[PDB]
Scaffold this active site. Structure first.
Site, PDB file in Angstrom:
ATOM      1  CB  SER A   1      -1.416   8.308   3.064  1.00 45.32           C
ATOM      2  OG  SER A   1      -2.171   8.703   4.197  1.00 45.32           O
TER       3      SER A   1
ATOM      4  CB  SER B   1      -7.080   9.823   1.752  1.00 49.60           C
ATOM      5  OG  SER B   1      -6.816   8.671   2.530  1.00 49.60           O
ATOM      6  CD  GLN B   2      -2.058  11.793   6.952  1.00 49.21           C
ATOM      7  OE1 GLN B   2      -1.423  12.456   7.780  1.00 49.21           O
ATOM      8  NE2 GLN B   2      -1.564  10.689   6.386  1.00 49.21           N
TER       9      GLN B   2
ATOM     10  CG  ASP C   1     -13.338   4.959   0.641  1.00 53.76           C
ATOM     11  OD1 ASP C   1     -12.536   4.318   1.365  1.00 53.76           O
ATOM     12  OD2 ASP C   1     -13.095   6.115   0.238  1.00 53.76           O
TER      13      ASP C   1
ATOM     14  CG  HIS D   1      -9.403   5.271   0.004  1.00 52.04           C
ATOM     15  ND1 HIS D   1     -10.205   6.237   0.564  1.00 52.04           N
ATOM     16  CD2 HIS D   1      -8.140   5.556   0.371  1.00 52.04           C
ATOM     17  CE1 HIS D   1      -9.450   7.077   1.262  1.00 52.04           C
ATOM     18  NE2 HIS D   1      -8.197   6.690   1.161  1.00 52.04           N
TER      19      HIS D   1
END
Length: 197
Positions: free
Chosen positions: A26, A104-105, A159, A172
């Site tokens: 993101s 992540s995303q 995380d 993260h």
């Protein structure tokens, strides 16, 4: 740099043997973000510049933070964009070995895309790496319909997104070393396992 469109720009008459499709996290820039470039340079060292095509997921994938809360951890538009790139690789270079990754995303996006992908194309993805996998707990560390031996998840202790939460804590943002060593090492090993030398 942060933008690589080797598959879109590449000539079908001179297809690379390996095509890597990667989705950023993101709010990250270009189509590779912070981790993609490190993985890319290492793949290039192993297969040579004309031997590997690096393709980031751009287009409709805007990597909007709020989309992490959607059912699949990303938007429908983003999944269609990544599915389109796998389909483009399959038509443009039928004999190339594919590899994928996401952060992540982007890791949720990679997982959703691979789950929905046509089996004949999904089966060409020799290995997939996921960093800070937001659906790690929910999917029990797997990508639905995809073999465990071809999957490598990098989830740091602390995380929170790896344990079912959407809170962004310091761990993260600590996947740099993984993108520089173990992630490309895994991808290279999985490609050589099927292609040989």
């Amino acid at each position: 740099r942060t933008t690589r469109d080797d598959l879109i720009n590449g000539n079908s008459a001179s297809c690379r043997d390996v095509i890597f499709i990667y989705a950023r996290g993101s709010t990250e820039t270009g189509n590779l973000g912070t981790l993609g470039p490190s993985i890319a340079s290492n793949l290039e060292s192993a297969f040579g510049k004309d031997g590997v095509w690096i393709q980031g997921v751009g287009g409709a994938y805007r990597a909007t933070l709020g989309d992490l809360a959607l059912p699949r951890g990303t938007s429908s538009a983003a999944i269609r964009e990544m599915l389109g790139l796998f389909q483009q690789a399959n038509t443009k270079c039928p004999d190339a070995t594919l590899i994928a990754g996401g952060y992540s995303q982007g890791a949720a996006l990679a997982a959703a895309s691979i789950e929905d992908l046509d089996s004949a194309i999904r089966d060409k993805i020799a290995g997939t790496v996921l960093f800070g996998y937001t659906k790690n707990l929910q999917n029990r560390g797997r990508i639905p319909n995809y073999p465990a031996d071809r999957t490598k998840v990098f989830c740091n202790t602390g995380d929170l997104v790896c344990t079912g939460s959407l809170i962004v804590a310091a761990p993260h943002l600590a996947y740099g070393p993984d993108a520089r060593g173990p992630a490309p090492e895994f991808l290279i090993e999985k490609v050589r396992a099927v292609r040989g030398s």
